[PDB]
Amino acid sequence: SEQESVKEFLAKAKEDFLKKWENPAQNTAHLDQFERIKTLGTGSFGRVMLVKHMETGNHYAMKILDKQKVVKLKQIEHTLNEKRILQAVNFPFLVKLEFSFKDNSNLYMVMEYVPGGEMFSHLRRIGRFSEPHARFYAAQIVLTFEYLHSLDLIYRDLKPENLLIDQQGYIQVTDFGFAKRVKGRTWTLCGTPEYLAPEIILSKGYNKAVDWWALGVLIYEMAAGYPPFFADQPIQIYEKIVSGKVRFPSHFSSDLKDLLRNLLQVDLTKRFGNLKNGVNDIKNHKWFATTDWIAIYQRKVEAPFIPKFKGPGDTSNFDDYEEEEIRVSINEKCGKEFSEF
Amino acid sequence: TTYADFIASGRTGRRNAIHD
Numbered sequence: 001s002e003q004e005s006v007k008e009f010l011a012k013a014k015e016d017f018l019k020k021w022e023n024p025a026q027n028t029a030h031l032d033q034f035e036r037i038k039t040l041g042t043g044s045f046g047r048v049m050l051v052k053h054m055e056t057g058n059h060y061a062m063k064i065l066d067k068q069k070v071v072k073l074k075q076i077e078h079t080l081n082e083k084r085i086l087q088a089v090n091f092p093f094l095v096k097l098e099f100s101f102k103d104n105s106n107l108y109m110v111m112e113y114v115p116g117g118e119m120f121s122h123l124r125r126i127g128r129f130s131e132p133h134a135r136f137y138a139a140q141i142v143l144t145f146e147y148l149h150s151l152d153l154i155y156r157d158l159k160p161e162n163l164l165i166d167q168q169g170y171i172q173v174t175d176f177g178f179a180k181r182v183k184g185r186t187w188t189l190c191g192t193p194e195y196l197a198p199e200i201i202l203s204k205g206y207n208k209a210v211d212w213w214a215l216g217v218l219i220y221e222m223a224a225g226y227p228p229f230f231a232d233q234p235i236q237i238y239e240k241i242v243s244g245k246v247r248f249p250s251h252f253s254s255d256l257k258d259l260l261r262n263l264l265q266v267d268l269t270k271r272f273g274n275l276k277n278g279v280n281d282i283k284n285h286k287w288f289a290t291t292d293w294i295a296i297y298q299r300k301v302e303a304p305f306i307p308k309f310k311g312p313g314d315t316s317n318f319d320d321y322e323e324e325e326i327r328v329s330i331n332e333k334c335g336k337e338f339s340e341f
Numbered sequence: 342t343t344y345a346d347f348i349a350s351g352r353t354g355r356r357n358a359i360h361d
């Protein structure tokens with residue numbers, strides 16, 4: 001009967017998504033309404049900055065993408081997907097999208113500012129996570145992937161660098177730049193080398209299952225302190241993944257080893273998450289035996305770590321990047337290309 | 342150790358995506 005309670009939730013959930021998916025939100029703000037403070041990260045065609053909405057006083061994090069740059073690398077459909085999906089979704093562990101707009105040069109997504117830093121930064125600092133601590137994060141990624149997949153969405157870029165810690169010590173998934181709504185197979189060669197399912201590497205066409213594979217790679221980086229497949233150039237990392245030969249740290253509990261052994265399965269018809277029981281095979285595993293899946297959805301569990309921050313607009317849990325002025329050119333660039341944004 | 346090899350590796354820094 002708890003299984004039926006989720007079924008209902010994700011049915012009402014998918015009704016919401018479709019109303020926003022079919023009729024998406026446009027030009028709900030402007031560049032001049034935001035005072036730009038500091039850069040929080042970057043990417044191939046832009047950056048994310050801390051900002052202040054001058055009329056509400058509130059802080060947000062604003063992604064800024066160069067329209068011309070996106071076209072040069074042929075990445076239009078991806079950038080359009082990010083916004084469409086982000087504006088559509090709604091979940092305790094997904095960064096919100098508050099505003100979006102475009103001007104002559106760039107695309108702009110203003111998201112709720114998550115001041116805790118990226119998991120990545122913390123994990124590198126501390127070294128590695130206690131399994132209980134890594135169970136707390138993993139379980140929020142399970143629920144979120146149970147959510148996304150039921151809207152027929154594949155995430156494709158899970159890794160510590162895109163998992164943000166909020167003030168209550170939980171996760172906001174960011175970077176939906178390779179998210180794609182697909183029923184059936186897709187064949188795009190994208191992701192981060194250390195998180196790619198072998199099927200992707202092998203140009204096979206693939207599905208939701210790659211997200212279960214990444215969840216295992218992620219948990220293993222959380223608990224070991226380093227990924228299961230690594231080296232000094234991608235091509236050497238690719239060979240390790242298809243080889244299908246993992247090796248576990250000696251501290252890893254035996255339940256962790258059996259979980260990972262089942263998510264890091266090369267054979268797609270054996271991987272947890274692509275089987276007849278679905279996601280429940282994961283939820284019902286012994287490593288997750290102490291996990292109250294509903295306390296976690298409801299955010300009533302005690303986070304094993306809360307990041308320190310001394311007032312709003314504090315950027316102290318984030319690295320320092322070189323700054324750059326924002327040139328908005330006098331002529332519209334790529335208007336037709338991004339006309340749905 | 343394997344922790345040690347990782348720490349010395351080119352890939353302990355934030356990792357970019359690849360794409361088409």
Ligand SMILES: COc1ccc(O)c(C(=O)c2ccc(CO[C@@H]3CCCNC[C@H]3NC(=O)c3ccncc3)cc2)c1F
Nearest residue numbers: 041042043044045046047048061075113114161162174177
């Ligand atoms: C095809 O490639 C794509 C697709 C979509 C995209 O938006 C992009 C980007 O160009 C792009 C630009 C800047 C970033 C910066 O992202 C920061 C730092 C990198 C790691 N992910 C975390 C992210 N931080 C946040 O989004 C954030 C949000 C709210 N509060 C704090 C941080 C990411 C992608 C992109 F390169």
